[PDB]
Amino acid sequence: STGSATTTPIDSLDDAYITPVQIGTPAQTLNLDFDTGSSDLWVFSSETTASEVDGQTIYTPSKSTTAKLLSGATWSISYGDGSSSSGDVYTDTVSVGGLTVTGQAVESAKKVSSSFTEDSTIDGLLGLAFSTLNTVSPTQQKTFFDNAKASLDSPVFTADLGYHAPGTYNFGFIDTTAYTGSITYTAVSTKQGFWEWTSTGYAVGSGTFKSTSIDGIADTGTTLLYLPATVVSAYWAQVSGAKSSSSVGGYVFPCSATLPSFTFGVGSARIVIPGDYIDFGPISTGSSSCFGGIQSSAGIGINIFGDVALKAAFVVFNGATTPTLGFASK
């Protein structure tokens, strides 16, 4: 089997992407944030504290003939941005882009933090990291991909995120029309539960490439590119007036700037992030200070190849017995 679903930016900045997901019988379609940096499929639901729901579409398990309480199971998750959610668990039929999994753990939120409430466009998350990170207790649950894997034509999914435009998540096949040139594959460590890999270096604009190993994670659920402070300083030094602002929470730059590109290495291959991808617009409405899309990972504890990086590439998440990651230009 295979699946193919379009993923759509939630706003004009590509802050996140939503993908429609069918849950239950008859189908309830919710728009979920596919997150290769976590491993829980959770939804706003009929159980979510009413004051914490503001415009989201909810899953109502009592209206699904295939829903079953997973008795005694609870979940609770905290994300890198400080947001969180928790609740109980149902199993139900879940379909993405025509690919169906029966008996998927659907984690029903009883509570969500303010950031989730305030974002009316995201109805929940669909985790695509390794199932070892799943938070369900006392019986850890598998991701949608892990459950689907055996049925897939090939044990892979791909992320093809758009810049200010829709893109695609495919399951079970590689669309050879969706990228240019060849795909370069690189080793993955699953030791921390992430799609963790080592970039071979970087360049700023038309500058020379610096060969240096940068360990980080491919994380579709993180908006920006977070890299070591040395790398980030080298990038922003090429933008007149750019500076790190503790009050704003990162590097800002004059909105009048033209940003240089940023290149990262994948083996001997190179992925170029155009300068425009690094512009996250005014820090507050009408400001002439703009927020940068490359930020320091210092104090996160890990480097993160988030959407800014991934949307410059066609990315293969190869879930074979020895997982790997592939990157192609597009």
Curated annotation (Swiss-Prot):
Active site: D35, S199
Domain annotation Peptidase A1: ranges: 17-328
EC number: 3.4.23.22
Keyword annotations of the record: Aspartyl protease, Disulfide bond, Hydrolase, Protease, Signal, Zymogen
Catalyzed reactions per annotation: Hydrolysis of proteins with specificity similar to that of pepsin A, prefers hydrophobic residues at P1 and P1', but does not cleave 14-Ala-|-Leu-15 in the B chain of insulin or Z-Glu-Tyr. Clots milk
Annotated GO MF terms: aspartic-type endopeptidase activity
UniProt-listed GO biological process terms: proteolysis
Enzyme's top EC category: hydrolase
Disulfide bonds, paired cysteine numbers: C255-C290
Keyword Cell membrane: no
Entry similarity comment: Belongs to the peptidase A1 family.
Protein name: Endothiapepsin
Organism: Cryphonectria parasitica (Chestnut blight fungus)
Gene: EAPA
Entire protein: shown range: 90 to 419 of 419
